[PDB]
């Protein structure tokens, strides 16, 4: 499908595609960091702290 490169500048198409893919990769990595399930920066041996004796991590709200 060479027709695409007849109508789109190869330098601008690669700059746009490269920036898009890099932005997409950064966004998806962050989306995994948002979820603690896939937050690999917590460490492979991550264990959530155990709450005992009526502990609550957060104050009560609404």
């Amino acid at each position: 499908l060479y027709k695409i490169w007849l109508a789109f500048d190869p330098r601008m198409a690669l700059i746009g595609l490269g920036a898009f893919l890099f932005a997409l990769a950064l966004f998806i990595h962050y989306m995994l960091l948002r979820s603690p399930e896939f937050d690999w920066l917590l460490g492979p041996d991550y264990a959530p702290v155990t709450l005992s004796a009526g502990m609550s991590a957060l104050p009560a709200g609404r």
């Binding site: 499908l1 060479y2 027709k3 695409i4 490169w5 007849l6 109508a7 789109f8 190869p10 399930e37």
Partner: protein, 42 residues
């Protein structure tokens, strides 16, 4: 002829654009297979 590439220049660009895309996609598939083994999401 909007940019200036002929029928030959455009086909040469498309020839390795697919090859680079295939190389990029192949690494992506390996990455997701490894990602699935580490921690499946579905």
């Amino acid at each position: 002829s909007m940019t200036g590439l002929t029928e030959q220049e455009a086909q040469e660009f498309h020839g390795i654009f697919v090859q680079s895309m295939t190389a990029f996609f192949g690494i992506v598939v390996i990455a997701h297979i490894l990602a699935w083994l580490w921690r499946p999401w579905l």
